[PDB]
């Protein structure tokens, strides 16, 4: 038993990515996930609703709990320009 973080992520086409993470594990894991699903770090931003934050611009070396991503959050992807 250990703190877990549930994430949901809207794609630019309206689909949803869902996955549970370890609240303790580094942000980088998240970045890798989205990359894995076809949305590479250099092309897509991962965004929060309110407050508005560029998740992918947060410290990758920081835990999910550290970036207030706990216990459940919906995020969305946006193309970089």
């Amino acid at each position: 038993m250990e703190p877990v973080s549930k994430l949901r992520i809207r794609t630019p086409s309206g689909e949803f990515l869902e996955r549970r993470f370890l609240a303790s594990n580094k942000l980088q894991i998240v970045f890798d996930f989205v990359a894995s699903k076809g949305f590479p770090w250099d092309e897509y931003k991962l965004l929060s609703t309110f407050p508005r934050r560029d998740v992918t611009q947060l410290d990758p070396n920081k835990s999910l709990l550290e970036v207030k991503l706990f216990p459940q959050e919906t995020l969305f992807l946006e193309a970089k320009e």
């Binding site: 949901r8 609703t49 309110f50 508005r52 459940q72 959050e73 919906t74």
Partner: protein, 177 residues
């Protein structure tokens, strides 16, 4: 679709409403999900749901703007349900409300409208009236059309049309708060 009692907001952003954590779980809602709200007179709204530790399980925290669109007051009852189906907007048309643009300064779009939507996730519904902060005043706009309709999320790519003559505020468009 469950009903909750209306309470004051701790967050004035017009796009957001708040619930208790337990409430959210019951509803299978996550922080940041878009929700479909129903009020009085067949009125509706789309919002982002947030968690809030100061919120009673039996209530929802809801800004004036939202309250107005829903024709509800503090202590009234609304319905809430998840709305993940909402699509990004292609095009929208908005118009300023006559009585809120008397002697405005600067360009309507650039000063007032654009910064509402710029770098912001804004779920909108047809017939919505929303308030902006630009220019030391309080301009209001009405959503007169959307594609898609009636609901959409205003995205960076969304074409925002504002041109046209200021509209008269309708009877059931008066502020209740």
């Amino acid at each position: 679709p469950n009903r909750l009692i209306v309470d004051e907001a701790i967050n004035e952003d017009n796009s957001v409403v708040s619930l208790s954590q337990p409430k959210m779980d019951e509803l299978q809602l996550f922080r940041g999900d878009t929700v479909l709200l129903k009020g009085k007179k067949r009125r509706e709204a789309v919002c982002i749901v947030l968690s809030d530790d100061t919120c009673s399980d039996e209530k929802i925290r809801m800004n004036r703007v939202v309250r107005n669109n829903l024709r509800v007051r503090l202590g009234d009852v609304i319905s809430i349900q998840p709305c993940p189906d909402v699509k990004y907007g292609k095009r929208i048309h908005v118009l300023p409300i006559d009585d809120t643009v008397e002697g405005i300064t600067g360009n309507l779009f650039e000063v007032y409208l654009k910064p509402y939507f710029l770098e912001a996730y804004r779920p909108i519904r047809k017939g919505d009236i929303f308030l902006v902060r630009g220019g030391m005043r309080a301009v209001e706009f009405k959503v007169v059309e959307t594609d898609p309709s009636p609901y959409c999320i205003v995205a960076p790519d969304t074409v925002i049309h504002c041109e046209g003559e200021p509209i008269k505020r309708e009877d059931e468009e008066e502020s209740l708060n």
